[PDB]
Ligand binder design. Structure first.
Ligand SMILES: Nc1ncnc2c1ncn2[C@@H]1O[C@H](COP(=O)(O)OP(=O)(O)O)[C@@H](O)[C@H]1O
Ligand SMILES: Nc1ncnc2c1ncn2[C@@H]1O[C@H](COP(=O)(O)OP(=O)(O)O)[C@@H](O)[C@H]1O
Ligand SMILES: Nc1ncnc2c1ncn2[C@@H]1O[C@H](COP(=O)(O)OP(=O)(O)O)[C@@H](O)[C@H]1O
Ligand SMILES: Nc1ncnc2c1ncn2[C@@H]1O[C@H](COP(=O)(O)OP(=O)(O)O)[C@@H](O)[C@H]1O
Ligand SMILES: Nc1ncnc2c1ncn2[C@@H]1O[C@H](COP(=O)(O)OP(=O)(O)O)[C@@H](O)[C@H]1O
Ligand SMILES: [Mg+2]
Ligand SMILES: [Mg+2]
Ligand SMILES: [Mg+2]
Ligand SMILES: [Mg+2]
Ligand SMILES: [Mg+2]
Lengths: 371, 371, 371, 371, 371
């Protein structure tokens, strides 16, 4: 009777039963296939490797991500990832359990049909739903009013919610995300002669960004000091014993989120879209949203991001308005934790799209029960 | 139903049925022909002598090796050696039994056709295969990951294998081998006035190198000590009672493998090619290869070679990486023992090149089933 | 008052005054040192040989290239090459003349300081600049809009230029070049038993590739025909009278640029990076770049490369878009000819980095006047 | 002696001498500035581009419109546009000629002073006037009684005129216009996965709306049919050969003008404000206005708009009253053509605001000679 | 200040001051001692006879050569020969003059110490050197590149020199020489019944070989003709009037150098070692050595040897390579003439091994200053 809260994270798939408080599995969404012929006969080899397998065989595999900007580009890759998720990681047969998926808002409608038909006719789920990720993030705080800024592996979006009403004219989609910051980090490391090229090495640079990067409060003073304050510089080890030394490159990376023109992006910075979504609201409610500005998603984990956000938005919003950036701990899981709560809420049983209803309407039925 | 594991060693032919644990015959690959006319009539003489015959008649024969650098230079000599191997040493008719041969990698393709056509139309074998020697060496340890350094009578090569995948872009062929060390030992012995010239005497110098030579750990301190430490010097007897005295010449011979410029060779030493083959690998797997660095071939039998290898490669590879030179005993037979195992492995029955398949494709078929 | 257009080619150094139309000197960038002791006393020997000297003494020298992938690895070798270039080949004192250098984009910044400090304090140049090679190539056609594909001895890169604006977010660096094709040609020649090993012999294989190789338009039909059409095969002489015969090896070499997986490279082929650099551009300008697709660098000299390029990119770009591969003659010098023009253009006198400006800023000044 | 009929269109500036019958120049009101540094030296570049220049360089420019909702937001941008208009497009010196401007009614009075002072002291015009756009539209029909519905790029308004008297208590200003319809078209195209983001791409979507959109007479039956009648769907080409397919999106765009709640606008539809302006009139004259309901402005060019207007207003106005929507051809220029006539009418010479009169009154004088 | 160019010829000692152009003394290296008791009292007899004395008393002496294969076997005999050379033939005291000796390469090192200690402590020379004979031969032609084939009384060797660098990995030592040809001539003369046995008679057969032997160009046709062409046969007188008649024995002697299997030698003929030394060289330089193939030593004086050499090596070396056997006149002295030049060359004064340096290092010092 418990729901399977699944997910379609662009980076990490997340899964675990409702009523639990932490996800049971987290693993990268990678499909990999061998690049060279097997020559030691009888390995018990496989045609393809997924999850942890592909982070270990990482020297001999072509790696693909089947998700780009939240749009699934290859359904035969994407179908294998789920076929692994149910049968091997959770080890639970899906035809007993209602399955709750998620996606970003403002997606090409054809994706919502494909996921529905795969669930109803490969896996034969009893029922399905398709929630909108930012809405689930808000239940983690137990609030009912706030602007959500959510920034995953592959997209950033804003959704203002007031009194449990969404304002669908105000949503912003901003295609700037951790995958872009990683691809930019490869170019500034090349200034020091370290060279990375392959998909096997992208997965090594990403381990730097999770450990040594932090956000400066006054980037101009910081970068002027970094010319002399050698105490900034830090050292890290590759898999082989090759040492790496890192300097002002520690913070020129996450500075991209506040000045996307560094990666040549035309779209405004994350605070300028956070502000400009409030300006779409009726001139009453603005006072309430400045008190409930909630952040989620892993690309807000960098130490000091909340302190920067407050100082930036204080320059835009008028004075006498107080601003309260609510950036709680564990915000790397809120989108999943909120999923666990909602799937347990007694009233939601009205919304399960039945198998019988799809056979009469055809796939388009899921356009009737969303924004 | 058992396979004949044959071989094409440059020095010693090795043969014996699969499922046995030691080769039944080992003898030098020499064809010899008389240099002078028979004058005591009625000896029951022969036109040519092969194997043990030629190591005994060694005063009256012209000796030839039909193998140079793993490339067979004379097919009519080479065909006699096998004609001896089956009918007289194993005393088994070959037209019952699948025959497994070996060769070094990176060979002129014409050799692989000649061996195939001789097997199919002189001996009329039922089936054939052509394995790559270094790959077979790895089964002797029962490993599935490692760098193999194999150095026979006539060639040295490296092959890194990861997860049962070979990396054909990384293979090194190095034409420095025991035959060169023997031809160099003849020149430094001449410093003491002992004189050897003929092919009958090359086979006597080789008996020195197998008995009195050893590898110094600190060649500069060793050679500086050898000027005074008379306890280094050793004595040995020729076939006649002529005594020989040997001194710093005990170790200046195997020092050649680490400094080929002594024989004027331009190519780097065996550890520098062992290292530089790892540097062709993707920056993930290096950590695994430093733990599985396996040696085989008779020119690694010298006492103390493994201890030298470790100290040399520790200077090249970064610290904090542990290095484990796995130089097991009996490594003079691993290439054959691994052959016995592989020919018994149940899955290999898919690979036997049938007689029927050669008559349709022609000799080129064997280019389709190798690197 | 005329500029010295120097260069840092990975293969051939090129030099000659501005306002001339062809370079006065071209010679390989090799430093060589003797491998054996001089024994005929009184030769008038030298410690080291550079340029033409080392292509003649080619049997007794260790040869090094001081340039790898456009990154200078040894400054004491590299300083000798220039010390030869000014004083012996041009026979002109450099302290009169402004000196214009070049380098590939996306290089470790430390190299740009070293070259600057050597010019200001060994040679005492009056002024210096550091242009970006692909930008100079475009002046040879007198165009102001186009995508440049430039592929020298040691690196390949793409730079789209529109209306005289570079788009620094779109540049591709691809480390696949003639030096890799030569090292691959040594392995497929070994199939026929010809053996080359030493740096003296690499400089002989390279003479084959410049003379007998050509690009097939339909590699699958060509290779299927080459099994029977003996009229493909060609013969060539080594320095000694040893004849060589070459067959399908004529074209399997330059096929590498379109399928780098043959040398096991993961990066896409030169047309796939040429295409994928256009896809970084704003959806307006693509129509203009398909009309101005200019090639330069010696590794585009092979007969028939332009005809292959057009047929390949026509499969990627949509129809109704016309494609015009502009592959003019003399494209082996465009990067130098464009240098001669730019150094004569009246407005460039604003950009000469003065000696006085370096003494105040220190070496970092050259980071202020580039991409 | 002829007047310069200039204009302040929100989208297209329009200019041409009085007594001509068609405007001599029409070009977008855009100022653009380069986004990246010039790197091909000596282009003859400019700091800023205006008019046709900016529709061609459209891949490298930041574009701004200096007009929003008829309120000029930046006077230094706006002053350049006119500086281009006189000296380069008309190529006529303005200090000879009386200049007639226009603006929407109900504007912040400060704008009317700024335009006046710029004309008197930068350009030194001999005289000026400031007509109200909807009043000029009526002379194109040669009528003297009618309700005008005028809907330009940036504002919509209604003005009833009876017997040449305006009724200033009845004017409606409605801030819904083509710029809003374009920004809404970007969101429904994203349903099909086509993505546009930048100001360079807004100017491409606008080319769709001028070509494929039309107004349905019975939107509910049309949209119900569009689920099956594939003959609705149409195809169009981007600048690159990318084909686009469009379906019910052809007509859901201009449906916004009749149901602004689709874009979440609270204000009533254009017919409901057209009706509710008549209800402000004295209960005599209504019969006359239903016979002279004249439309102008480009956002009434869509095929079939007049037929929809008649059926809508027939539901509001009582029966037995006949309704006659007068939607003539060329209504894209009436506001300019009527300007040409009025500036030639002999009696208007009483109204030219003299230079002498401004120096005595100060800028406020223009509040004395309007509504 | 002039050097004493001495020598250690196996057959003829050669001596004469530097700066002279011909040796002042040449005499056989023989020590002889009486075989019978003196019985005519008061002859003024001597215990031993050396040089010309022993060629005259040749009927009553035991003769010994103290040199065998270039290795001195008896130092008390060898010390007398020099004691004669200085005090009686040159009549010059050696303690004034630097003394230059020679030896063959590849000799037992103990010989180089013995000669050094005898020179420093019996004769008390001021300085010494030990040159390598084949290197001195090359100065006679004034060349700096060539392969030297040198074949004295007691050894044959090859040394390729390129650009004044020797290639110590390529040297061949071949122990086939005039002393062997003389001992073979004694056996074929015995076919005609002439009998020689004693050391007194060996010195008579040697006078035949210097006068009647010549090399056939086509030995098979020559020997077939010699069965009938009596005009071949020649006659010669012994010391007594005994006439000797010689026929095909004129040329079957020097034919041994091209087919050593006639004397049962296993080693290849002098042209096969001359060729096979070139094949040790890097594949560049071979073209240069075929143009500078210089011969020296008395066993190349036979009429027609050069014409045979060219026809033989033309069969081995590929065509299109030209071959130029440089066999100049006076080649019986080149090894001495080149000694006279080198000892006069101004730079050689750096190499004289001082007396002071030997007393510190001990005898081993001379291993430091040679190959
Ligand atoms: N400790 C960390 N510090 C900073 N960033 C992190 C850290 N751990 C993970 N990340 C970033 O989190 C991203 C994944 O965000 P996530 O919210 O999981 O996206 P999704 O849920 O859509 O997979 C990774 O791409 C990585 O860049
Ligand atoms: N006891 C020993 N110590 C050192 N070297 C040995 C010993 N026995 C044999 N060898 C060397 O082993 C070489 C043969 O190596 P091997 O692996 O048999 O080559 P292959 O297998 O190709 O014939 C011989 O040439 C000899 O130099
Ligand atoms: N005739 C030719 N045909 C094909 N390739 C050539 C020819 N001549 C030279 N090359 C190639 O040109 C390369 C040098 O390219 P180049 O543009 O000179 O590089 P760089 O300018 O950086 O030295 C050489 O490595 C060689 O492989
Ligand atoms: N052929 C067409 N069909 C429909 N709309 C059009 C067409 N041509 C132009 N438009 C619209 O006309 C608008 C401009 O209206 P216009 O009356 O020129 O405003 P202004 O005069 O204030 O610039 C443009 O924004 C565009 O949306
Ligand atoms: N006229 C000649 N023709 C052929 N051979 C000669 C002649 N004169 C001398 N010889 C040979 O020259 C040999 C001596 O060679 P030589 O170069 O003097 O040796 P070395 O210099 O070491 O004494 C003698 O043994 C003799 O056989
Ligand atoms: Mg996420
Ligand atoms: Mg072996
Ligand atoms: Mg170049
Ligand atoms: Mg208008
Ligand atoms: Mg001699």
């Amino acid at each position: 009777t418990t729901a399977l809260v699944c997910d379609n994270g662009s980076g990490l798939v997340k899964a675990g039963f409702a009523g639990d408080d932490a996800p049971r599995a987290v693993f990268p969404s990678i499909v990999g296939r061998p690049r060279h012929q097997g020559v030691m006969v009888g390995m018990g080899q496989k045609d393809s490797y997924v999850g942890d397998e592909a982070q270990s065989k990482r020297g001999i595999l072509t790696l693909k991500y089947p998700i780009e900007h939240g749009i699934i580009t290859n359904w035969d890759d994407m179908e294998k990832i789920w076929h692994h998720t149910f049968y091997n990681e959770l080890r639970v047969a899906p035809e007993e359990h209602p399955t709750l998926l998620t996606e970003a808002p403002l997606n090409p409608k054809a994706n919502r049909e494909k996921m529905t038909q795969i669930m109803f006719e490969t896996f034969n789920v009893p029922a399905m739903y398709v929630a909108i990720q930012a809405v689930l993030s808000l239940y983690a705080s137990g609030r009912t009013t706030g602007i959500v800024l959510d920034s995953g592996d592959g997209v950033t979006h804003n959704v203002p919610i007031y009194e449990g009403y969404a304002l669908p004219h105000a949503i912003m989609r901003l295609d700037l995300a951790g995958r872009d910051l990683t691809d930019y980090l490869m170019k500034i490391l090349t200034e020091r002669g370290y060279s990375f090229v392959t998909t096997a090495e992208r997965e090594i640079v990403r381990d730097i960004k999770e450990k040594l990067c932090y956000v400066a409060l006054d980037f101009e003073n910081e970068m002027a000091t970094a010319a002399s304050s050698s105490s900034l510089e830090k050292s890290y080890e590759l898999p082989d014993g090759q040492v790496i030394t890192i300097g002002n490159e520690r913070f020129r990376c996450p500075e991209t989120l506040f000045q996307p023109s560094f990666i040549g992006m035309e779209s405004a910075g994350i605070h300028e879209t956070t502000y400009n979504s409030i300006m779409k609201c009726d001139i009453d409610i603005r006072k309430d949203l400045y008190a409930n500005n909630v952040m989620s998603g892993g690309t807000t984990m960098y130490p000091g991001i909340a302190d920067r956000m407050q100082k930036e938005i204080t320059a835009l919003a008028p004075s006498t308005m107080k601003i309260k950036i609510i950036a709680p701990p564990e915000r790397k899981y809120s989108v999943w934790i909120g999923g666990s709560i909602l799937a347990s809420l007694s009233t939601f049983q009205q919304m399960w799209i039945t198998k019988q209803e799809y056979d009469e309407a055809g796939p388009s039925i899921v356009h009737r029960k969303c924004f």
